[PDB]
Nucleic acid binder design. Structure first.
Lengths: 401, 902, 405
DNA sequence: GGTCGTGACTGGGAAAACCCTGG
DNA sequence: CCAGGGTTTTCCCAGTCACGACC
């Protein structure tokens, strides 16, 4: 497993996962209690979130995404206690044993909890969104965000995992049809951006009440990890969330009024981010190059400069940077590197960073028309004019699918 | 007691059962004959072995309608064939009216008398019909034109879309666009297609209309083998049909008269040849069992539902995903080769060192920030203005290796995708990028001499080419399906597919993506070869109004969807031996997770309230060959050592010939089965040599030839274990008319030894066994129909896949149906005994190991068909309950030996 | 007086059109202000997402020295906001009354000293990542980190509000210059979209520690409310987080290496969202026409869809094709043609304006004839005809022209 | 054995280009 | 110096060759 650690030192060096080597342990990164990611890691999370938002909300008509509050308020994982009230209680020396016990019991019985499962948010907003969709069924409410989980440490700890969830309220007649359809669509989404989607697997699980859902995994170099889960929870949770009459809790399917149903998805995006990291690097002369797919790689264009007329070269590079930024691409402003590093070392750094193309602006650009362009996929040079080059890049992104 | 044995102390039929079947009289071999048999079996060394007695059967069998068994079965077959025999006699005396002068453009059926006058008719009701349909593939799966000559008047069937102009109807397919035709018999050329167009063979209740195929009787009388017809076509050498397919609907409405004249001429000529050869079909098939079994076989029925739709659509979609992955894998390898350019490292690689790599040269306050940005952008656009130079035609990626440009799409073309998107699996750069290894040595391609391998030996062998002066490595040509005289194309070939399975071609370097496209190709081989066939099936979706009330009253009916049928368009007599040969359905394939979409059988599932009873006729042809050898040796069971091995043989104990041959030669199980089958089929010594050459190549020509000679000296003896069967077949071939031992039905006249003499023996050697199998299946279906008509048991013939037989039954009679099958098998073996003069029958041979009862079609009731295209399986995606297996003791315990409902 | 009633009518629209969700009892001005609301609706989620996108385009995109960071929602212990508590342990401890008063207080303290915290600002993650980022950028001061995300604060309950935080590690010499630059850019960016830029009031301020900064306010009818703040930090924070070698915390301008001053730009997003919701509300002439005229760069959904009279299937096909074409071009839409029980055309226009849809698109059989569709504007409600092959380019041009101006 | 797929070899009028030249 | 002629030089549609699924 040296290559797994050799990837980890690259993922630490070139600003993907924040921290030091001591906390660079498998359980720390896999358990959601990670010490943070780098800036490129945050942009990779944003790219994954953008692709999920296209796949789920943009290209599906009935998905109206919703946002529920971060903490679940009491009465009733973990509990929260304010510092000011604790200070007031502790500073009151006149308090006896019984009053402190009563205060502690009240706190334990009136504590909000940081959320774990986002199903309750949709179960809260369902009536309002039923008013929204003009009672058109099926539909669903989506959301991405960080959830809070206990850490079962063998040595208390809170692990933060970013989760994208959607509660597809469906008619009960066509429940498993939608379940199979969503399994196919989301497994296609998790297989769309991979070097080897054979490592992405699929298995089915059965709930205690007879409900059946599917589980997805990734063949890591040390065993599978759960990357998404599905559970068609029926209608027990929604009925439990609104006791009484079922006048509000209903809907229309075609011409038949029916009680809705519950489907769920739980996508640990951080787990998938590390999974795609392990998918990019696959373990003659070795070339330590991260082969991220050309839609999720965090920085696309690399722009540099050579020795010479630094005023005019810097003007050209700054203009090119602003021109590309106006067209939505992201460039790494490497032209300010006065500390002259070799093109071999610069390319090695920019190829560990999973950058799509490296654009080299030499004096010959100021001579006639030519800029160098080296592709990460081929590591072979090319010449281009500036005026064409922009469009090349954008169609490359448009050709990701 | 009931237990009894032969003089060879093998457990024979029970005394009560033998008395019930044979009637009276027990026999025994002659003293000199039995002494010769004892000495011969002592010579082979298999004499003197124990045999654990199986429990006997004490069952009051149903009475036989006839003192002679063969005469009673002949009377039963005559009773079955009597309405169809009368209809065929009417077709013999059928009068052909002259050509009508007009052909009306009416929907459905139109009658034209001797004067050709137009008569509006709905359902023509002739007892005998001669039919030919015209299929309009340009309008989906809907045929258009059908003819029916008759003793009374001409009948024309025009489709609904023919009269109407274009017009929009319901999607998918329904029998409403099909022909709505006392029992009736339709005889014609490819009446399977007509049955696919005839509505009357789609309900689960069954019908009484049957079909005789002039293709089938034509192959029975005057047919040709593959090589004989190929040589006849080669020696023979030295427009409406194509137009009708491309006619859409308007052009079909345009050239109507000439096409109708062609159809009338074809119907008339086929009817003339048919009525000439119908006495030939009668005398060449003297048993009415032939006619009854063919009529039962030609009405094969398969039930399907919406889930089969999934097995179509998803599988193709699944293939797309797999196809995508394959392309991606290839591209990855291509990218790797770019790095090999560095420092001319590609001048050292064993695989990628003979391509076009050389580089191509190139031819020829806020105001402060606002002002700075505007000036910088203006300078940028002024540099963009430098466009009045460089070649207007761009160079297609100079500097890269030239072959990488050759794999790349040109920049101007709108079908542009990143990377080498033009690369396919069959390019000449695909194997070199895969770094393929042929058992420790790399591959090598030449346009001069195909593909081979380079071995670092120059400074054993397989096709030496000393002309190829590769430095340091001798070049030996890769083996081919047609020897060393031919050249192999792309190494990803079908014939190289078994060589792909046993690790004769692996990549090695690049351990993930190197040997991954190989696995993808070996997975998608089946669906890539058969997707056109499977997508071309004409599924007909049954309306609920004519559906049986058994499923309608049952709560298990799916009201949201519909059901349907697939009619196997299988040629019943489509071989020289008239074996049921069809490349799509009856192929010997089973569902695996390593063939894409290999659950083709798995969607043949029973409707609610119904089930399928399957009998796997185990060692059918093996026992036929063994009993021919035993009958020609001494006319008993186990006369030869091979016959005793057939009687006393267990795969678990290894007492078969398969384990002995595996020890002796050293080949796989399938290789041993193929070798023993071909030797049974009549493989010659060159056939054995090429069969050994096709298998593992750890030997040479001389060693394989010596092993084949040693193997030939054992089984056939000095020609031993099985040569009595060979002498029996030679005695059959010595006669003027080659008559089968089982039925005497003569093969087609191409294999008569009058103009062939002692030639083409292997085809007839296979033909005797396969015609015996045809008689076996016909007798099994005849006995099932007779017991259904005798004990009022429901059911329908589902399919007869070569060896196995599946019957579509209702649920409540399942065990009863299974019981009938057991007795049927006994009678079948008994009939073989009664067609070989045998005076006894073994206990174990007459009974199958088990009979399966299931709600879905599969080989065994333990496999759920886990495939890439059905990843969850039937137990999760479809929730199908697994089947059950029964033995004769279990069936007797469940049914108490009762012949009626309790 | 009537302005508050109109605001409540806007909130009732927000309940009806699912910008802000809740109840009429929850419709309290300070409950909106602090963050005691049960949460905005989906259209409000789209409004916040567009506002966050505009911020991210403003700050992190067009700067070569500003990088994105993401501080966790918790700070681990032992530490010096509420306190994170694992419940089961506390319940088990509370099950015992044998321990005396002193023991109970002592163990409460013992738990308290090892208790993580939900965060208050976004500073401390960037402050911890300063060493890594200084190693990354090779000390070319100034350089910045940024984060948009939620933060929890106590209300005399716990309320979560999404804020935007920019941390500027600058040389001490250029401190006032970069402060003035960021203040001017921030004020212009907040004045960029609103109808009345004079309402955004910026005031300089200094704290008790002599820490200079600025405050931005928007004028609700009930007075001024805070939108964004700027502050200095000095240099004791980096030493407090990283005591020891100061040259390891040194950044370089020219050749001079100094401990960098830290500047904070922290701004509320949801309160400004409420302010822009008030800003877009107008009454155009007992009840006038309520128009929610959001800026095109910040409106939730741009172009809706309607059907005419004639073929149901063909009009649905045309609307679906236009929906997909706008999906590929990336313009937010509203496929709300599915209502069988349709209201009046004036009522349909009022309903689509209540969703603050920019333009209303109507498709008739004349679209099947020639490709023209009816297009209604928002402010002037003018109805025109435009061909189906250029409406996406026209809307792209409207968005880009609003962005350029 | 014969037929219709796919992909390699090539090859000739042509579109642009380069060198030289008439006036 | 500006358009035209002789020679280059690929270039791209098209033909021509081979072998692997099918009949």
């Amino acid at each position: 497993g040296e290559g797994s650690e050799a990837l980890l030192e690259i993922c630490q060096r070139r600003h993907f996962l924040s921290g030091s080597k001591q906390q660079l342990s498998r359980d720390s990164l896999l358990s959601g209690c990670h010490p943070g990611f780098g800036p490129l890691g945050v942009e990779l999370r944003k790219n994954l979130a953008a692709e999920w938002w296209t796949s789920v909300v943009v290209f599906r008509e009935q998905v109206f995404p919703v946002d529920a509050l971060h903490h679940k308020p009491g009465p009733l994982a973990f509990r929260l206690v304010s510092a000011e009230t604790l200070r007031e209680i502790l500073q009151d020396k006149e308090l006896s044993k019984e009053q402190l016990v009563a205060f502690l019991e009240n706190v334990l019985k009136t504590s909000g909890k940081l959320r774990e499962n986002l199903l309750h948010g949709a179960l809260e907003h369902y009536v309002n969104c039923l008013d929204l969709v003009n009672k058109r069924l099926p539909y669903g409410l989506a959301q991405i965000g960080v959830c809070f989980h206990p850490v079962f440490d063998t040595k208390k700890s809170i692990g933060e995992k970013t989760e994208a969830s959607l509660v597809w309220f469906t008619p009960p007649r066509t429940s498993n049809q939608w379940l199979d359809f969503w399994l196919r669509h989301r497994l296609q989404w998790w297989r769309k951006f991979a070097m080897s989607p054979s490592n992405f697997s699929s298995s089915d699980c059965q709930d205690e009440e007879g409900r059946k859902g599917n589980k997805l995994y990734y063949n890591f170099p040390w065993g599978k990890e759960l990357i998404e889960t599905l559970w068609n929870l029926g209608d027990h949770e929604l009925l439990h969330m609104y006791p009484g009459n079922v006048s509000k809790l209903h809907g229309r399917d075609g011409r038949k009024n029916v009680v809705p149903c519950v489907l769920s998805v739980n996508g640990d995006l951080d787990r998938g981010m590390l999974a795609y990291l392990y998918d990019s690097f696959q373990l003659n002369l070795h070339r330590k190059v991260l082969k991220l797919h050309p839609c999720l790689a965090p920085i696309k264009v690399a722009l540099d400069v050579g020795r010479g007329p630094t005023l005019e070269l810097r003007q050209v590079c700054q203009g090119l940077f602003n021109e590309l930024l106006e067209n939505g691409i992201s460039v790494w402003p490497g032209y300010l590197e006065t500390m002259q590093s070799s093109l071999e070392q610069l390319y090695s750094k920019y190829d560990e960073m999973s950058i799509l193309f490296t654009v080299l602006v030499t004096e010959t650009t100021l001579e006639n028309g030519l800029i160098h362009l080296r592709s990460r996929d081929t590591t072979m040079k090319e010449m281009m004019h500036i005026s064409k080059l922009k469009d090349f890049l954008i169609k490359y992104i448009s050709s990701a699918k | 007691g009931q237990l009894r044995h032969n003089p060879l102390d093998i457990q024979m039929l029970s005394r009560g059962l033998h008395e019930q079947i044979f009637g009276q009289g027990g026999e025994m071999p002659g003293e000199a004959a039995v002494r010769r048999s004892v000495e011969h079996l002592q010579k082979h060394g298999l004499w003197g072995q124990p045999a654990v007695p199986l429990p006997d059967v004490e069952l009051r069998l149903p009475p036989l309608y006839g003192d002679n068994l063969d005469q009673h079965f002949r009377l039963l077959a005559q009773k079955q064939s009597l309405p169809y025999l009368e209809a065929a006699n009417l077709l013999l005396q059928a009068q052909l009216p002259p050509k009508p002068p007009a052909w009306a453009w009416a929907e459905g059926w139109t009658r034209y008398g001797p004067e050709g006058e137009a008569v509006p008719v709905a359902i023509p009701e002739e007892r005998a019909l001669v039919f030919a349909v015209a299929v309009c593939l340009a309008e989906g799966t809907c045929p258009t034109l059908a003819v029916a000559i008759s003793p009374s008047a001409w009948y024309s069937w025009c489709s609904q879309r023919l009269v109407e102009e274009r017009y929009s109807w319901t999607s998918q397919l329904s029998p409403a666009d099909l022909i709505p035709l006392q029992e009736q018999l339709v005889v014609g050329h490819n009446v399977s297609f007509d049955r696919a167009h005839i509505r009357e063979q789609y309900l689960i209740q069954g019908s009484r209309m049957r079909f005789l195929d002039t293709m089938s009787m034509h192959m029975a009388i005057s047919g040709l083998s593959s090589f004989q017809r190929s040589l006849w076509i080669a020696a023979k050498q030295g427009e409406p049909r194509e137009l009708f397919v491309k006619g859409t609907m308007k052009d079909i409405r345009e050239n109507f008269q000439d096409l109708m004249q062609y159809c009338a001429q074809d119907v008339w000529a086929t009817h003339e040849v048919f009525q000439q050869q119908l006495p030939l079909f009668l005398e060449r098939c003297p048993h009415p069992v032939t006619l009854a079994g063919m009529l039962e076989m030609g009405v094969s029925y398969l039930p399907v539902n919406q889930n089969w739709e999934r097995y179509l659509a998803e599988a193709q979609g699944t293939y797309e995903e797999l196809q995508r992955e394959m392309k991606k894998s290839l591209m990855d390898l291509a990218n790797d080769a770019c790095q090999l350019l560095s420092g001319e490292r590609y001048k050292e690689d064993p695989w990628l060192w003979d391509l076009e790599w050389d580089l191509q040269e190139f031819k020829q306050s806020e105001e402060e920030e606002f002002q700075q940005d505007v000036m910088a952008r203006a300078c940028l656009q002024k540099l963009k203005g430098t466009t009045e130079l460089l070649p207007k035609r761009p160079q297609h990626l100079p500097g890269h290796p030239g072959w990488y440009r050759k794999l790349c799409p040109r920049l101007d073309d709108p079908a542009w995708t990143p990377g080498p998107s033009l690369l396919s699996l069959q390019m000449r750069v695909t194997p070199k990028l895969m770094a393929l290894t042929w058992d420790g040595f790399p591959l090598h391609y030449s346009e001069r001499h195909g593909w081979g391998y380079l071995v670092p030996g120059r400074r054993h062998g397989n096709g030496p080419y000393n002309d190829v002066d590769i430095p340091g490595c001798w070049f030996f040509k890769l083996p081919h399906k047609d020897g060393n005289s031919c050249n192999v194309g792309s190494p990803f070939a079908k014939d190289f597919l078994p060589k792909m399975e046993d690790g004769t071609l692996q990549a090695g370097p690049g351990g993930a993506s190197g040997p991954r496209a190989l696995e993808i190709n070996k997975m998608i081989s089946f669906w890539r070869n058969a997707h056109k066939r499977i997508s071309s099936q004409m599924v007909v979706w049954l309306p609920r109004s004519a559906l049986p009330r058994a499923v309608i009253r049952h709560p298990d009916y799916d009201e949201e969807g519909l059901y349907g049928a697939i009619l196997p368009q299988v040629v019943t007599a489509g071989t020289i031996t008239r074996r049921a040969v069809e490349p799509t359905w009856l192929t010997a394939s089973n569902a695996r997770p390593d063939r894409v979409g290999s659950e083709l059988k798995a969607m043949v599932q029973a409707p609610p309230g119904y089930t399928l009873v399957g009998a796997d006729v185990d060692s059918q042809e093996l026992w036929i060959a063994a009993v021919l050898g035993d009958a020609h040796f001494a006319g008993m069971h186990g006369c030869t050592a091979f016959g005793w091995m057939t009687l006393q043989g267990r795969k678990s104990r290894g007492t078969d010939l398969h384990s002995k041959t595996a020890t002796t030669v050293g080949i796989s199980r399938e290789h041993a089965k193929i070798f023993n089958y071909g030797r049974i089929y009549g493989a010659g010594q060159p056939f054995a040599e090429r069969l050994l050459m096709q298998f593992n190549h750890r030997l040479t020509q001389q060693e394989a030839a010596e092993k084949a000679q040693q193997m030939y000296a054992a089984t056939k003896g000095l020609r031993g274990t099985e040569s009595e069967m060979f002498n029996k077949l030679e005695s059959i071939a010595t006669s003027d008319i080659p008559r089968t031992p089982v039925l005497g039905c003569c093969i087609s006249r191409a294999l008569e030894p009058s103009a062939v003499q002692e030639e083409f023996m292997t085809s007839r050697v296979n033909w005797v066994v396969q015609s015996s199998a045809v008689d076996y299946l016909h007798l099994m279906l005849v006995a099932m129909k007779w017991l259904f008509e005798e004990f009022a048991i429901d059911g329908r013939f589902c399919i007869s896949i070569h060896d196995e037989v599946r019957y579509l039954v209702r649920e409540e009679d399942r065990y009863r149906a299974a019981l009938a099958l057991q007795i049927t098998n006994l009678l079948t073996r008994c009939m073989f005994a009664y067609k070989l003069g045998l005076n006894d029958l073994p206990q174990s041979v007459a009974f199958f190991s088990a009979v399966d009862i299931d709600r879905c079609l599969r080989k065994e009731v333990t496999m759920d068909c886990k495939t890439p295209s059905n990843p969850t399986g039937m137990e999760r995606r479809y929730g199908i309950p697994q089947g059950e297996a029964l033995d004769i003791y279990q069936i007797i315990e469940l049914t108490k030996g009762s012949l009626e409902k309790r």
